[PDB]
Write a protein that binds this DNA or RNA. Structure first.
Ligand SMILES: [Mg+2]
Ligand SMILES: [Mg+2]
Ligand SMILES: [Mg+2]
Ligand SMILES: [Mg+2]
Ligand SMILES: [Mg+2]
Length: 146
RNA sequence: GAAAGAGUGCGUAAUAGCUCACUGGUCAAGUGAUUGUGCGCCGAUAAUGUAGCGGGGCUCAAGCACACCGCCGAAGCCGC
């Protein structure tokens, strides 16, 4: 019948994605794609069998239009009147990384498996990362023509 | 006579003056006015928390209109 992975069937690859002058939504959508494992013919929605993704230069992300001043990130502290908002602007120089990862978390499934999947994401604001030991192969944001 | 309006606005409370509509000039090609529309702007404004895209995100469209090319999709139809 239909193939389902056994215990030692999942193999993990390390991708590094450069984020310099890339659209935030495009980068995050692709990273979510190859973080969930949608690019593998052995995909199965039950199993967490994606790949590791490093995002490099999360500072240099591109946000189009006029969202660096009028787009907000809202958090609520649970206390009455405990809502705070930070623009994309402030969030890009206070601590930038979460901006990129915020987008990716919004495109992974919001279940327990999504929590397991998140752990494979490594966002770095700098141009360099500490994971050179896993030989991360560079990944290009490609579109397949039709 | 070109240029002088029973004199256009300020202000002199009235005049005056500042000016203007209107002819002379050096300049160097456009310049001003409507009507039919396609998309947008403002008017815009409530009380637990974003809160009038389902979310992330989208103008490098993932928005809109017109053509075209595929595909997904039901217990519908077909196949056994
Ligand atoms: Mg007069
Ligand atoms: Mg004059
Ligand atoms: Mg949407
Ligand atoms: Mg069916
Ligand atoms: Mg039937």
């Amino acid at each position: 019948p239909t193939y389902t992975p056994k215990a030692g069937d999942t193999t993990r690859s390390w991708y590094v994605i450069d984020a310099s002058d890339v659209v935030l939504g495009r980068l995050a959508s692709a990273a979510a794609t190859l973080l969930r494992g949608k690019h593998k013919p052995t995909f199965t929605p039950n199993v967490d069998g994606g790949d590791f993704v490093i995002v490099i230069n999360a500072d240099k992300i591109a946000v189009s239009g006029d969202k660096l001043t009028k787009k907000f990130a809202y958090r609520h502290s649970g206390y009455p009147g405990g809502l705070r908002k930070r623009t994309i602007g402030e969030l890009l120089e206070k601590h930038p990384t979460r901006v990129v990862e915020n987008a990716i978390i919004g495109m992974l499934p919001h279940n327990k498996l999504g929590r397991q999947i998140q752990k494979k994401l490594k966002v770095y604001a700098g141009p360099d990362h500490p994971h050179a030991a896993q030989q991360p192969i560079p990944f290009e944001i490609k579109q397949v023509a039709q």
